[PDB]
Tab-separated table of C-alpha atoms in Angstrom:
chain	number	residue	atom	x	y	z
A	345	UNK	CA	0.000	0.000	0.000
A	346	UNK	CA	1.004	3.529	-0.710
A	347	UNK	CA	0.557	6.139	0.836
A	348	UNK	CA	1.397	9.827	-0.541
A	349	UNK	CA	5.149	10.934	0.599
A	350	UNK	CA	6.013	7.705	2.489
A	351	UNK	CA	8.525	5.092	2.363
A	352	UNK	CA	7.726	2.005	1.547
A	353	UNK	CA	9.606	-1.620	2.979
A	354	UNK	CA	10.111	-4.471	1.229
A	355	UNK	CA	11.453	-7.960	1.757
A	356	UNK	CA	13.614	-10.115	-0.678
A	357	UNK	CA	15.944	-13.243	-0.764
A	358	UNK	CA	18.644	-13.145	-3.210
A	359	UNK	CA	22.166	-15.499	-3.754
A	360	UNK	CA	24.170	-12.542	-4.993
A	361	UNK	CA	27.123	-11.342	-3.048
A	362	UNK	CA	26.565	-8.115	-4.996
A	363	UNK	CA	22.815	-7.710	-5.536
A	364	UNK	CA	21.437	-5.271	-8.238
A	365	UNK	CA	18.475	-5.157	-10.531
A	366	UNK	CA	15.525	-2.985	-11.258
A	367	UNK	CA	12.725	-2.958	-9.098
A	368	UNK	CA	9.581	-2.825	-11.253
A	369	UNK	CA	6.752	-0.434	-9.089
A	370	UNK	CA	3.059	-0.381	-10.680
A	371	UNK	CA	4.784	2.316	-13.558
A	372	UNK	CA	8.212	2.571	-12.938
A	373	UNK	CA	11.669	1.090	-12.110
A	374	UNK	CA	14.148	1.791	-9.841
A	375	UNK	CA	17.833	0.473	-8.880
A	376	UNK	CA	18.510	-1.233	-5.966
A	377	UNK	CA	21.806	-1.471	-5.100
A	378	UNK	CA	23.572	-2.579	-1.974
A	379	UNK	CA	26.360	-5.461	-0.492
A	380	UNK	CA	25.134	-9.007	0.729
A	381	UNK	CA	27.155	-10.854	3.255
A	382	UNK	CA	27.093	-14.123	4.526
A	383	UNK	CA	24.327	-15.751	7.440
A	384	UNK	CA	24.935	-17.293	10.588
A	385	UNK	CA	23.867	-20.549	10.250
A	386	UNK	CA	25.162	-23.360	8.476
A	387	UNK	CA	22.386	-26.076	8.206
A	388	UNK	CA	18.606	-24.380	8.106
A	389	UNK	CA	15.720	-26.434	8.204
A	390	UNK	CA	13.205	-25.283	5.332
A	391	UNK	CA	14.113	-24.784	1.428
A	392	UNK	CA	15.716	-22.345	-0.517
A	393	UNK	CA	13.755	-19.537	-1.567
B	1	UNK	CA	31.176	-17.531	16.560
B	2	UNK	CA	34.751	-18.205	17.816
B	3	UNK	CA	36.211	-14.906	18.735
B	4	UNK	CA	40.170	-14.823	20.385
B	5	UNK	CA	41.538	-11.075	21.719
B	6	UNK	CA	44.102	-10.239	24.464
B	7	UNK	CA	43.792	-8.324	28.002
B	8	UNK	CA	46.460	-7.228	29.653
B	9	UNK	CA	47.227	-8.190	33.278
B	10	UNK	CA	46.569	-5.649	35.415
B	11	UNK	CA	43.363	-5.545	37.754
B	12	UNK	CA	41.347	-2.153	38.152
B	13	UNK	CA	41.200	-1.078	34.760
B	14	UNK	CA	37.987	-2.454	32.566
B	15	UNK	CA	38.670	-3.663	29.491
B	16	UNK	CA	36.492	-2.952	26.561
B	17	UNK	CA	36.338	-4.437	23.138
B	18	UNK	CA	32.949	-5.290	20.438
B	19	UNK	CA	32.649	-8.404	18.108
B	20	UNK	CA	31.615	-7.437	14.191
B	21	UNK	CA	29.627	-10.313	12.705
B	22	UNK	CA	29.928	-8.620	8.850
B	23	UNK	CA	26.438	-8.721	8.251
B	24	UNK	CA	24.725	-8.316	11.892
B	25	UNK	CA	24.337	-5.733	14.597
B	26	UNK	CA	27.857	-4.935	16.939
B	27	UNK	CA	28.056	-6.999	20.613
B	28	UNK	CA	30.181	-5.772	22.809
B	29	UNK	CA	32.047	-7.309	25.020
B	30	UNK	CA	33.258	-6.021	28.693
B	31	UNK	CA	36.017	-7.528	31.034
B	32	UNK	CA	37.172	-5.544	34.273
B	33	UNK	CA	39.411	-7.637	36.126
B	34	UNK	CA	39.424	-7.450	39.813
B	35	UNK	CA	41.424	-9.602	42.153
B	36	UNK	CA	44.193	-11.808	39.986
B	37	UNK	CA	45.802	-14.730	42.362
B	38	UNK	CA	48.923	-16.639	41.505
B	39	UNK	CA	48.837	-19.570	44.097
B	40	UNK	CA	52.142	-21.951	44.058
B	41	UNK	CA	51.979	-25.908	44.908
B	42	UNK	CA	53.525	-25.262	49.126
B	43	UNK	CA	55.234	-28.132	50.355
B	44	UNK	CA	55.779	-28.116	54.029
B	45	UNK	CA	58.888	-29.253	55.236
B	46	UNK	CA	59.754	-28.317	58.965
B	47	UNK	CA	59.254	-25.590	61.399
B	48	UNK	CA	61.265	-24.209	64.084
B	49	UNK	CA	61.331	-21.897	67.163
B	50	UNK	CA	63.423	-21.234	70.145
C	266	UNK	CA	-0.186	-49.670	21.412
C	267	UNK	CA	2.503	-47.437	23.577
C	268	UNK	CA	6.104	-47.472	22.044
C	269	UNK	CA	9.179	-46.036	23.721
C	270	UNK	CA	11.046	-42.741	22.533
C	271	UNK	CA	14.751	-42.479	21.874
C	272	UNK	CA	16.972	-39.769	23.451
C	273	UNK	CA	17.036	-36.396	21.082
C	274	UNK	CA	20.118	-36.477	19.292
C	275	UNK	CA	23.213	-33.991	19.491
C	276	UNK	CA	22.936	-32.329	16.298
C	277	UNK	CA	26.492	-30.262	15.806
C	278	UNK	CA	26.727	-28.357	12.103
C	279	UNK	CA	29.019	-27.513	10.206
C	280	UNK	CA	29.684	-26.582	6.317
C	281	UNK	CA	27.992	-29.172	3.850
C	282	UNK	CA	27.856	-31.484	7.162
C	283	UNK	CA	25.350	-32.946	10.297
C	284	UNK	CA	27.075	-34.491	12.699
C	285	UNK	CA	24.959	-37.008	15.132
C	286	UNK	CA	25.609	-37.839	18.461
C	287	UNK	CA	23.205	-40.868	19.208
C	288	UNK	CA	22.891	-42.816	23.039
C	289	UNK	CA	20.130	-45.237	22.936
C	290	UNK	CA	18.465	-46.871	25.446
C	291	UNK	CA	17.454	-50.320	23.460
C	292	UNK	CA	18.276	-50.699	19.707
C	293	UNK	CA	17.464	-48.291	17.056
C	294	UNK	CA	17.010	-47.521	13.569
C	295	UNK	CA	18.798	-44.422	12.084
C	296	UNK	CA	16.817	-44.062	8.561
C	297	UNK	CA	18.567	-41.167	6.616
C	298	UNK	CA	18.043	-40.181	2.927
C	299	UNK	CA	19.124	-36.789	0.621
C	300	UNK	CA	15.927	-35.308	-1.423
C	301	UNK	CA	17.444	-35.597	-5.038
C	302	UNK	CA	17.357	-37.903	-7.519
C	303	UNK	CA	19.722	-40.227	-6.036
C	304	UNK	CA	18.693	-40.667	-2.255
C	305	UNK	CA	21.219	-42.960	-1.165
C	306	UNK	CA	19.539	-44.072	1.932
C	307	UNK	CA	20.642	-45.677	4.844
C	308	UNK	CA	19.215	-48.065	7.377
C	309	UNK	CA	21.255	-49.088	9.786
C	310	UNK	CA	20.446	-50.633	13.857
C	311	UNK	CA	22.490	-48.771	16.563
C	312	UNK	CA	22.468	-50.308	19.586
C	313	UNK	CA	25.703	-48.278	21.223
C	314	UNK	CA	26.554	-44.746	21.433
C	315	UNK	CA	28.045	-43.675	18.164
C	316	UNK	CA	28.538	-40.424	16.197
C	317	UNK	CA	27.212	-40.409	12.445
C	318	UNK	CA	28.815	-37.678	10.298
């Protein structure tokens, strides 16, 4: 939901130890662009996503 | 999350220091030593007096 | 009919790896399988304590 100045939050999953694509929203696309690093745990019980 | 650092010997003085998991928040760590012993293995042999 | 219930297993991790710590009380199967196309199961009877990496 937007609102009119806000922010909004999203959550994603993502293998790359550089992550950076266009995020598609309802018109337009924008870059997200950031650094991954690695988790904490070693065996996790439910699939990848 | 095996983490190895050094303190110096001397009691009083707190020692500070924070671990940096790369992708997590900062945990510090705090160590103020207070009372250091150093106890030898005493072997009684004899005593004497007048 | 009531049936008895092994102790809970010591599960250590590592990379690519389960390690198994395993005391039972009376004999035991350990059933294991992966979830590809080749499962390459496992059914073995412990009846001692033994770790299963």
């Amino acid at each position: 939901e937007l609102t009119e100045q806000g922010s909004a939050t999203i959550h994603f999953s993502t293998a790359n130890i550089h992550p950076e694509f266009r995020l598609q929203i309802c018109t337009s696309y924008v870059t997200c662009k950031g650094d991954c690093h690695p988790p904490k745990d070693h065996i996790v019980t439910h699939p990848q996503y | 999350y095996e983490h190895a650092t050094t303190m110096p010997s001397q009691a009083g003085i707190s020692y500070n220091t924070i671990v940096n998991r790369a992708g997590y928040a900062p945990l510090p760590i705090s160590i103020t030593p207070t009372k250091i012993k150093l106890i030898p293995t005493v072997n009684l042999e004899y005593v004497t007096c007048h | 009919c009531t049936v008895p219930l092994a102790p809970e297993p010591m599960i250590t991790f590592g990379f690519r790896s389960v390690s198994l710590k395993l005391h039972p009380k009376n004999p035991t199967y350990l059933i294991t399988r992966q979830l590809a196309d080749e499962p390459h199961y496992t059914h073995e009877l412990i009846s001692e304590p033994a770790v299963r990496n």
